[PDB]
Write a protein that binds this DNA or RNA. Structure first.
Ligand SMILES: [Mg+2]
Length: 86
RNA sequence: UGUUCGGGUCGAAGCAGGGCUGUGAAGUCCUGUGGACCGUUCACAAACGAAAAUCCUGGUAAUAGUAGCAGCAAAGCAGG
């Protein structure tokens, strides 16, 4: 069950260095890598709620937000449930 | 091919590498492989000897893990 519950505020400023239309994929990869290194788990262990995917693709694939605030959960079996914090 | 004398499953031809002979074309022997045919005297024949033809046919290098997999319609991400 609950072993590590904390709210994060992932910055996405390095995402804005790739070409314009490839920014959303890079945003997804960046969020996943942030959670991987701040939760100490393998890459596959990380799961993303559809709210995060909705938020990153709100304004097309060229204008991802410059920040995002998530609320992740860690379980003993390994999985991490990241869902969009308010 | 005609003729004389022979060899071979106790291992013929062929192939790889060596020893000796000959100025040389080449001959003969030894070792490994191979599994069925091959020589020699005297003569006679020829669809008879290749390193080259921007030669012919087949096999195979370097170039090289290289060019290309962009240009006219830049399309995908999350969960299951
Ligand atoms: Mg030739």
């Amino acid at each position: 069950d609950m072993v590590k519950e904390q709210i994060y505020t992932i910055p996405l400023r390095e995402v804005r260095k790739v070409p314009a239309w490839k920014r959303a994929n890079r945003a997804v990869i960046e969020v996943r890598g942030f959670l991987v290194r701040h939760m100490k788990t393998e890459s596959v262990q990380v799961k993303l709620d559809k709210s995060i995917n909705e938020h990153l693709w709100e304004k097309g694939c060229e204008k991802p937000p410059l920040s995002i605030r998530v609320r992740a959960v860690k379980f003993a079996d390994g999985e991490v449930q990241a869902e969009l914090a308010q």
